[PDB]
Design a protein around this ligand. Structure first.
Ligand SMILES: *C/C=C1/C(=C/c2[nH]c(/C=C3[NH+]=C(/C=C4\NC(=O)C(C=C)=C4C)C(C)=C\3CCC(=O)O)c(CCC(=O)O)c2C)NC(=O)[C@H]1C
Length: 304
């Protein structure tokens, strides 16, 4: 376990392309990313231990209050965000009720959004083409082709693993400019235990610049538990510089990867790489999110 030891879940930093705010269970600001001042225009060391009401507009707190005290408490779905300071901003992104804190992840207004009809088109065709569920090999390739058709990543591919957690690429499509790993296998050390354990419970992962400077999370002391701040579900979660190397190697300054859950069990991953630094509309992500959700289902009617 030269590999499986790293605490990648508690690195106490996020990627700069958005920010984070962590509230205690009585709705008071507890910790944030240190770039908070840069964009919302509010100084961290001030915020620490004051009210979430100082940052959000009155609805976003209220939509917040209802969502959380909703029964079936869990890492929340995406929310619409407006700040009292810089309302204009209209940042939009998720929240996450883990660690006995309420994490808010906020993203910059994804300008130049997916054309509607084209969107519905690709979403709908895929769910037909995948549900049309030809073989396993197409079901998958399909997902990759379609996924590439939605996002427009330079190369995309379905990765499955054996019971010894070594995987094979079992599908592909590429911009005719980069090799097909369609025949390669890889060793379980490559995506190791703790990262397999993490993908099972949070099925989206996105890195836009592999060449980034991590935005510390301050404090990174969980006030309720007194352990570092645990960034499992955070899609802004700073990433193990080892792996980053391995993406520099294979020549890709952006990634994203989606789990393929098969009854609590991680069957395989959609895996995307893009030469230069590349982002995804929540649209873009939730689409793919969908692809793998159906695929996983168009695997649970191929398993009978
Ligand atoms: C022994 C340590 C190693 C290691 C650790 C490591 N790697 C990751 C993350 C990923 N590695 C991936 C592998 C691939 N990328 C590809 O291009 C291909 C295909 C040829 C594979 C199989 C991938 C996709 C990931 C996940 C990244 C993503 O979500 O897009 C981690 C986890 C890092 C984190 O979650 O913060 C770790 C600890 N890297 C190695 O290559 C070996 C030597």
């Amino acid at each position: 376990s030269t590999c499986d030891d790293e605490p990648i879940h508690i690195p106490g930093a996020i990627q700069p392309h958005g920010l984070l705010l962590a509230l205690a269970a009585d709705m008071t600001i507890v910790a944030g990313s240190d770039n908070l001042p840069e964009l919302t225009g509010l100084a961290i060391g001030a915020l620490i231990g004051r009210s979430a009401a100082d940052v959000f507009d009155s609805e976003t707190h209220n939509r917040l209050t209802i969502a959380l005290a909703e029964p079936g408490a869990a890492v929340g779905a995406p929310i619409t965000v407006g700040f009292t300071m810089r309302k204009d901003a209209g940042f939009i992104g998720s929240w996450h009720r883990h660690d006995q804190l309420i994490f808010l992840e906020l993203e910059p207004p994804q300008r130049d959004v997916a054309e509607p009809q084209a969107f519905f088109r690709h979403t709908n065709s895929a769910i037909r083409r995948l549900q049309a569920a030809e073989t396993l090999e197409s079901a998958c390739a399909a997902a990759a082709q379609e996924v590439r058709k939605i996002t427009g990543f330079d190369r995309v591919m379905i990765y499955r693993f054996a019971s010894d957690f070594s995987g094979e690429v079992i599908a592909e499509d590429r911009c005719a400019e980069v090799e097909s790993k369609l025949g390669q296998h890889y060793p379980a050390s490559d995506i190791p235990a703790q990262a397999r354990r993490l993908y099972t419970i949070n099925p989206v992962r996105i890195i836009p610049d592999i060449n980034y400077r991590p935005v510390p999370v301050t404090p990174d002391l969980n006030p309720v538990t007194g352990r570092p701040i645990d960034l499992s579900f955070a899609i802004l979660r700073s990433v193990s510089p080892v792996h980053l190397e391995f993406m520099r190697n294979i020549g890709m300054h952006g990634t994203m990867s989606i789990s393929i859950l098969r009854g609590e069990r991680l069957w395989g991953l959609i895996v995307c790489h893009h030469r230069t630094p590349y982002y995804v509309d929540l649209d873009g992500r939730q689409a793919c999110e969908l692809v793998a959700q159906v695929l996983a289902r168009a695997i649970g009617v191929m398993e009978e």
